[PDB]
Amino acid sequence: AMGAPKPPQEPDMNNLPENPIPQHQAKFVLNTIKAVKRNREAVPFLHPVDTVKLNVPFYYNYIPRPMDLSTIERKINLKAYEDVSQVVDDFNLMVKNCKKFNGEAAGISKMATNIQAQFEKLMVKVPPK
Ligand SMILES: CN1C(=O)c2ccccc2Sc2cc(NC(=O)[C@@H]3CCCO3)ccc21
């Protein structure tokens, strides 16, 4: 049995905002994401979930909006965010996707929670708008 196809990759390069996040904030969040990427518990979240490699045919039926650290980093670099809260939203989406599919009690979900904790701690220092 086949499941749903992989959604189009983000960002939609066709709907960027003309007023992205100022460079000072964007530079801070980019450095924050790179810091998370160096976390050893971030390894599974570096790249998009590979539903064929992981043999989870229905992953996209349950997770219609996948997210991962490389997509967040690309959305910052390509100027796709309008507000730092959207960065936090995408990080939360990555974590919620993981818990939704794998269950709150799975090891991978604990790793998701741990890198979310690091991310939030770093974000405490984000410069104002
Ligand atoms: C977050 N997440 C998952 O949410 C996920 C989704 C479905 C099935 C298993 C998992 S654990 C998981 C594993 C990898 N990657 C690996 O385990 C690597 C690549 C294949 C085996 O080592 C990447 C993402 C991921």
Author numbering: 190 to 318
Anything the authors wrote about it?
BET proteins are chromatin-associated factors that regulate transcription and chromatin remodelling. The BDs from C. albicans Bdf1 (CaBdf1) share 31–46% sequence identity with human BET BDs and 58–66% identity with those from ScBdf1 and hence are likely to bind multi-acetylated H3 and H4 tails. In conclusion, Bdf1 BDs are required for the viability and virulence of C. albicans and can be selectively targeted by small-molecule inhibitors without compromising human BET BD function.
The most active compound was dibenzothiazepinone 3, an analogue of 1 in which the cyclopropyl, oxadiazole and pyrazine groups are replaced by smaller methyl, carboxyamidyl and tetrahydrofuran groups, respectively. HTRF and ITC assays showed that 3 inhibits CaBdf1 BD1 with low-micromolar affinity and three- to fivefold selectivity relative to human Brd4 BD1. The crystal structure of CaBdf1 BD1 bound to 3 shows that the compound is slightly rotated within the binding pocket compared to 1. (Both enantiomers of 3 are equally active, consistent with the lack of interaction between the BD and the tetrahydrofuran ring). Liquid culture assays show that 3 has little effect on the growth of C. albicans strains expressing either WT Bdf1 or Bdf1 inactivated in BD1, but significantly inhibited the growth of strains inactivated in BD2, consistent with the specificity of compound 3 for BD1. A dose–response curve revealed a cellular EC50 value of 35±7 μM, corresponding to a 20-fold cell shift relative to the IC50 value determined by HTRF in vitro (or sevenfold relative to the Kd by ITC). Our chemical screen identified a dibenzothiazepinone compound, 3, that selectively inhibited CaBdf1 BD1 and displayed antifungal activity against susceptible strains.
